[PDB]
């Protein structure tokens, strides 16, 4: 078998800008303020019009007033402008406000919306679960006394995806979302998320790429070239899958017959027997090491532990967080809450088992659904029908969620927080609608 090489750089988009001047002054605007991808579009369209990496930069250019290529896909023309392109999103919260104003101004330019006072359209926001009150007050500020939006409402994007795949609005289910920086498990009864019993794991997919960076740097402390973080996402989203059973795989993952098909070798760009030695199998794979070759110094020999990176959402103790995995959280939800005991299931628990949805940008790792359904049938009673639902692309289905909430008129008008209600009630106010957040107390 001839050993192949894998160059990881990602290409540059040559056409960044596309917008239309014709627009509807009464149709609302649906935007998903994702940690990884900004999504933008109208209401009448089924698919989101604009997909962006939610990042912006401040390019300093001499003799042209030092302010160019600010927001969006314009950073994707050159690697130099994409290098310092600062996504303002921290772990839980975005950080800078003028940056987010520039994101909103750029995307409002990209629907061709003309001024009419501030903005003549209602907005459709996505809000993270258990949001800090200061964030929601400053969100109220940056809509109302910044853009003059008449209609604001926001909710959990996983609940939006559940409403998208269950448009009836009164179904019972369990949604397991894995976002860029956060994963959570939320039970929905009668269309209403019982956030009181929802749980959260602080891993997401950003910490998975950070874990791969830390692993592959600790494996090779003397690597010649600096491995870029974008290339870490690139070779994470390509060679990482979830095993069916993690316990019996790691005792097989470094055998000689398994290394022929499991191991893929990546190549970084530039310009005493080894068979009995399992350190040679771990470091240099099923091929003998040529220490004089300039390729083998740059050979980024991954895939020996490609199972370890996506498994950590089931065992968060390998990631450093002392939290029970989504398997244990689903077990506690389906076997200890809503009147259900270990041994007999309530009807709500059976309906929740019969409708399980997984979504998010980190859900497109292969082997997730089979592992989820095998682990679910591990602890559930025999004969209980388990249905796990998946999307073709589970990252942008939340946008279809607020689109489906926008098509429904009477379900739109329950959740609308207006300017007048904000003015009489102050910025400390939460509409306890079912498709979103709730009060901190009773």
């Amino acid at each position: 078998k001839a050993v192949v090489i894998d160059d990881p750089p990602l290409r540059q988009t040559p056409e960044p800008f596309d917008e239309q001047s014709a627009y509807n002054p009464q149709s609302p605007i649906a935007i998903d303020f994702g940690s990884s991808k900004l999504r933008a579009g109208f209401v009448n369209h089924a698919t989101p019009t604009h997909i962006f990496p939610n990042a912006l930069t401040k390019f300093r250019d001499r003799k042209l007033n030092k302010n160019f290529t600010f927001v969006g896909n314009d950073t994707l023309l050159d690697q130099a402008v994409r290098s310092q392109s600062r996504s303002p999103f921290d772990g839980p919260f975005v950080t800078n406000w003028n940056l987010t104003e520039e994101i909103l101004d750029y995307t409002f330019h990209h629907l061709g919306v003309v001024p009419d006072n501030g903005i003549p359209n209602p907005i459709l926001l996505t809000e993270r679960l258990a949001t800090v009150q200061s964030q929601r007050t400053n969100w109220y500020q940056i809509l109302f006394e910044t853009y003059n939006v008449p209609g604001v409402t926001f909710g959990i994007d996983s609940l939006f995806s559940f409403y998208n795949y269950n448009p009836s609005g009164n179904k019972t289910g369990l949604v397991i979302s894995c976002g860029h920086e956060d994963t959570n498990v939320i039970p929905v009864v009668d269309g209403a998320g019982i956030l009181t019993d929802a749980k959260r794991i602080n891993w997401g997919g950003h910490q998975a790429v950070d874990y791969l960076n830390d692993l592959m740097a600790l494996k090779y402390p003397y690597f010649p070239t600096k491995m870029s973080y974008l290339q870490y996402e690139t070779m994470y989203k390509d060679y990482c899958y979830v095993s069916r059973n993690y316990d019996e795989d790691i005792e097989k993952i470094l055998t000689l017959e398994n290394l022929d098909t499991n191991d893929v070798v990546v190549e970084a760009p530039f310009t005493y027997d080894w068979r009995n030695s399992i350190l040679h199998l771990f470091l240099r794979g099923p091929r003998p090491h040529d220490s004089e070759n300039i390729h083998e110094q740059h050979q980024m020999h991954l895939n020996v532990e490609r199972i370890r990176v996506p498994e950590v959402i089931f065992q968060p103790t390998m990631g450093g967080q002392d939290q029970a995995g989504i398997c244990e959280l689903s077990e506690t939800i389906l076997l200890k809450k809503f009147g259900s005991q270990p041994g007999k299931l309530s009807q709500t628990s059976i309906d929740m088992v019969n409708n399980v949805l997984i979504t998010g940008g980190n859900a497109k790792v292969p082997g997730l659904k089979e592992r989820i359904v095998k682990e679910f049938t591990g602890f559930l009673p025999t004969g209980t029908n388990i249905t796990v639902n998946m999307s073709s692309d589970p990252s942008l289905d939340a946008w279809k969620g607020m689109a489906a909430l926008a098509r429904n008129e009477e379900q739109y008008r329950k959740t609308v927080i207006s300017k007048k209600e904000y003015e009489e009630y102050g910025p400390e106010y939460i509409k306890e609608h079912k498709l979103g957040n709730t009060k901190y107390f009773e």
Partner: protein, 45 residues
């Protein structure tokens, strides 16, 4: 001219707000905050 607030102290001054509210109320079980949403540690080894 709001300051460049980081993601660290926002959790702790929410926590300060929650203790201020519960000490001014008890002299009130929370429903869904950023801390009650947190997953408990696992019970199996």
């Amino acid at each position: 001219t709001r300051r460049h607030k980081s993601a660290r102290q926002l959790i702790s001054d929410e926590n300060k707000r929650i203790n201020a509210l519960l000490t001014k109320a008890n002299k009130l079980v929370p429903k869904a905050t950023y801390f009650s949403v947190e997953a408990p540690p696992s019970i199996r080894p």
